[PDB]
Design a protein. Structure first.
Lengths: 482, 83, 84, 257
């Protein structure tokens, strides 16, 4: 609303008392919500973010430890005195006191600021919470009215819900802060913020029950993936755990039911399943020898951290990243190719290309004991018909069309050849594969289409080469089949 | 509860049944017509290549005579480079 | 027990519907694959034979060039015979 | 959203046929993808049909070729389209093309003999094949019942595709009605579920269930109206001997008060 001017509320937030925390947190949340003219600039801000992450870490911690803060019987919790000193004592003379002490009767370590993040003793990894968007109805069922709602829609008559909603509000305001330049202020350097993200993840998914309303869990997942969307730079300090966490977070969406495990999403409900692949591209483009490499180790099937990692993979039971493939294969098809026109496509088309980009990128990362193939009466590939659509569009938004179709073709050829050569190297399957490969209606654009293409547009040279080499591999497969 | 579920089953049955009818009719039609087109294409190109090969053999006889007075495409080109 | 009768019947109908479904499914699929394989077969057949036609055309062109010292086929043949 | 088609998450799954009708719905989605791709398949199969002109074996369109042409393809008649696709593949195989436009192709007597009168011999070029297409579309295509057959071609599959679409649309609204019924029975299931949960919880130990439902009803009454933090604690002893944040909060107060 109004009033509500200053920024320095951070001070009060930094303070460790329930009162100040409420007073600020609620206000500043309402603030960052308002945007008509209300934005949080950056001058000497950062202190805000620090304070925030510190607060969240401590609260979530002692929550996991199941102990209420803000109220004990200790206070001003260290030394209090006015002893024998003016300014400089505790030299040699101090031992005299010992002497004194021996005749009158007739060093420390200090912890760092935040607490540890993982290895927490009570918190030991047991598989829970790998459930899909379905829980919304759970949420409904939870939020459903019933003689036992236990939704204290009012304030904290008990501190548990207090901590819950506290963290909730913190998450929300954190989201709202994250919609501008000053993403650079958030850019992977608020080591505090990253610690917060990490441990929050490690809880929300490995969540021994302390969260009241599942809807709170949804909120957390949701604004979390959003604020991720507004990151386009490094992550994954103490990576591996965090990398797997983020993967499970994005996998949260899409309906499950070898073959593809994911019914493609009927695009009229959700918009987060978007954010998922959005991040899995953006925050994954960095070919720096860390992130890509973490997921590469995730191909496999302090030091205790490593124990954790495999500890979850077998606690997700073969391979798993096929699930990531299937997930990536959602939201593209079966609606635009089933519409009445190609214009309403362009909207979600804008969204589409990053997906194929992510896919082909991960296919640079698959070149060892597996069984993988993903064209088995599961998708076919309307990619060809889609390419034709965008082509006809070309000769009849923008700036994304040509790259989309190009990378679609590249995707096709690369996945084909990689499948073939992989099951060649293993050679655990009959040459029927070729015949199998030769048995796709969604494949190998007809040579007549190639020909007529070779004439009209004349504005697609690179694409012409794409189709050219594609058809080349096609004819090769035909020949060497016999 | 079980009553309502049985009702759901009845609905699913209706759905599946209508879909089955669609499947049978439409797809048998499509596959029949495609098979016909395919076989037409097949036999027509068969006879095309037959006419071709015959013509080729005739040309072979001719050029054979001409070179002598100076598949078998192998021996043809062999005698060709020979001359 | 009429209830149990109904239940078993529901189960059996479920099974039968599933089986019919999957059978007809795979059946369509294999038919499609057959048609496809044979289609691409015909395609490459046509390709190779047009190639052969063009090939022997280039060959006889070379031969005509040698003579230095279908209609046009028999034409050049008769011309070569006359030269001989 | 997800609520609208289904809610099945867990219901105690009593007489767990829910997995089975689940599978039924799953296979419905299967059939959905099936029919979708089938429509697309028929489209694709059609695609070639308007563009083919090979059928000759069972006005008359096969126009004869030129001596150059019968020297080129060895074929005497037919359509220009077939000839031009042939020479297209010819350029492809001989690879006389150039790729810096690409349609520039290095000319050869195998070709230039198609137009030798204009003194193209003065310049064997690497020129636009389109120029040749323009050249050989009437320059060497010239001359020197079965009307029913024009019927049995591309139009067939198109028409049957239209019929299939029409009958699918015919059946659609029945499906819509069934979906309405699905939603209805689902909501009824849902309510009945709530009731059963309530009732069995009463079966458990009615004392606690009664107390809790009563208090919740009261709380609902209040929240649906103005709200007050504490209904009690006129019994001072409890909330004050067993609580001390009172002290600190007070301290904060008196400073201002």
């Amino acid at each position: 609303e109004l009033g509500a001017i200053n920024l320095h509320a951070l001070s009060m937030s930094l303070q460790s008392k329930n009162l100040g925390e409420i007073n600020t947190a609620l206000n500043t949340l309402l603030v960052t919500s308002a945007d008509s003219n209300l934005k949080i600039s950056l001058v000497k801000y950062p202190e805000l973010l620090d304070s925030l992450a510190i607060l969240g870490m401590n609260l979530l911690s002692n929550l996991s430890q199941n102990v209420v803060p803000y109220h004990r019987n200790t206070s001003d919790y260290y030394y209090e005195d006015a002893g024998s000193n003016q300014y400089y004592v505790t030299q040699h003379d101090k031992m005299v006191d010992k002497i004194f002490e021996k005749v009158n009767n007739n060093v420390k370590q200090w912890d760092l600021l935040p607490e540890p993040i993982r290895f927490l003793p009570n918190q030991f990894p047991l598989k829970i919470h790998r459930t899909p968007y379905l829980t919304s109805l759970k949420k409904i069922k939870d939020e459903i009215d019933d003689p036992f709602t236990k939704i204290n829609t009012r304030g904290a008559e008990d501190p548990k819900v207090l901590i819950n909603d506290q963290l909730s509000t913190i998450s929300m305001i954190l989201r709202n802060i994250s919609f501008s330049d000053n993403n650079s202020r958030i850019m992977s350097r608020n080591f505090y913020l990253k610690r917060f993200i990490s441990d929050l993840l490690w809880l929300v998914l490995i969540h021994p029950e302390n969260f009241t309303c599942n809807r709170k869990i949804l909120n957390f997942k949701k604004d979390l993936v959003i604020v991720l969307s507004n990151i386009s730079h490094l992550l994954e300090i103490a990576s591996s755990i965090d990398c797997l966490l983020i993967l499970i977070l994005v996998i949260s969406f899409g309906q499950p039911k070898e073959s593809l495990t994911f019914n493609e999403f009927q695009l009229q409900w959700g918009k987060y399943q978007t954010f998922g692949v959005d991040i899995l591209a953006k925050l994954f483009s960095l070919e720096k020898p860390n992130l890509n490499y973490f997921k590469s180790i995730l191909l496999n099937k302090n030091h205790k951290d490593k124990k954790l990692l495999r500890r979850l993979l077998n606690l997700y039971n073969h391979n798993l990243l096929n699930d990531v493939v299937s997930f990536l294969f959602s939201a593209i098809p079966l609606q635009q190719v089933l519409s009445q026109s190609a214009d309403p496509s362009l909207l979600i088309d804008q969204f589409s290309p990053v997906i194929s980009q992510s896919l082909t990128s991960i296919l640079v990362i698959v070149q060892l004991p597996f069984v993988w193939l993903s064209s088995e009466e599961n998708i076919g590939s309307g990619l060809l018909k889609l390419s034709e659509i965008i082509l006809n569009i070309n000769n009849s938004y923008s700036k994304v069309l040509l790259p989309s179709i190009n990378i679609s073709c590249v995707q096709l050829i690369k996945c084909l050849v990689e499948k073939s050569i992989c099951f060649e190297n293993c050679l655990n399957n009959d040459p029927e594969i070729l015949k199998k490969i030769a048995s796709i209606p969604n494949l190998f654009p007809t040579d007549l289409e190639i020909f007529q293409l070779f004439t009209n547009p004349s504005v697609d040279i690179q694409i012409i080469n794409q189709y050219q080499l594609l058809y080349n591999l096609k004819n090769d497969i035909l020949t060497n089949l016999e | 509860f079980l009553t309502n579920e049985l009702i759901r089953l009845q609905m699913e049955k209706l759905d599946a049944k209508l879909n089955h009818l669609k499947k049978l009719e439409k797809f048998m039609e499509l596959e029949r017509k495609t098979l016909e087109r395919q076989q037409e294409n097949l036999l027509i190109q068969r006879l095309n290549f037959n006419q071709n090969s015959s013509k080729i053999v005739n040309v072979l006889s001719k050029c054979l005579n001409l070179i002598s007075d100076s598949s078998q495409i192998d021996h043809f080109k062999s005698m060709l480079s020979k001359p | 027990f009429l209830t149990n009768e109904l239940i078993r019947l529901q189960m059996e109908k479920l099974d039968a519907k599933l089986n019919h479904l999957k059978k007809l499914e795979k059946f369509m699929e294999l038919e499609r694959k057959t048609l496809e394989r044979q289609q691409e077969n015909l395609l490459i057949q046509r390709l190779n034979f047009n190639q052969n036609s063009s090939k022997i055309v280039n060959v006889l062109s070379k031969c005509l060039n040698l003579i230095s010292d279908i209609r046009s086929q028999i034409d050049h043949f008769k011309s070569m015979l006359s030269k001989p | 959203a997800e609520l609208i088609p289904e809610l099945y998450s867990f219901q105690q799954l009593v007489d767990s046929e829910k997995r089975l009708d689940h599978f039924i719905h799953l296979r419905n989605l299967h059939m959905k993808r099936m029919v979708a791709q089938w429509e697309r398949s028929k489209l694709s199969q059609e695609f070639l049909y308007p563009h083919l002109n090979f059928p000759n074996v069972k006005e008359e369109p096969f126009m004869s070729y030129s001596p150059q042409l019968t020297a080129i393809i060895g074929l005497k008649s037919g359509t220009s389209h077939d000839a031009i696709f042939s020479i297209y593949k010819y350029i492809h195989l001989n690879e006389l093309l150039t790729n810096d436009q690409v349609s520039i192709v290095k000319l050869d007597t195998q070709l230039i003999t198609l137009l030798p009168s204009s003194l193209k011999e003065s310049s064997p070029d690497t020129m636009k094949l389109t120029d040749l297409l323009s050249l050989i579309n009437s320059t060497h295509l010239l001359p020197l019942l079965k009307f029913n057959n024009t019927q049995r071609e591309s139009q067939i599959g198109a028409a049957e595709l239209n019929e299939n679409a029409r009958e699918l649309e015919q059946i659609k609204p029945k499906i819509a009605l069934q979906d309405k019924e699905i939603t209805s029975v689902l909501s009824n299931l849902h309510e009945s579920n709530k009731r059963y949960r309530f009732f069995k919880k009463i079966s458990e130990d009615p004392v606690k269930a009664l107390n809790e439902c009563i208090a919740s009803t009261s709380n609902a009454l209040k929240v649906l109206s103005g709200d007050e933090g504490y209904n009690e604690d006129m019994v001072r002893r409890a909330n004050f001997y067993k609580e001390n944040e009172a002290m600190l909060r007070e301290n904060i107060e008196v400073i201002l008060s």
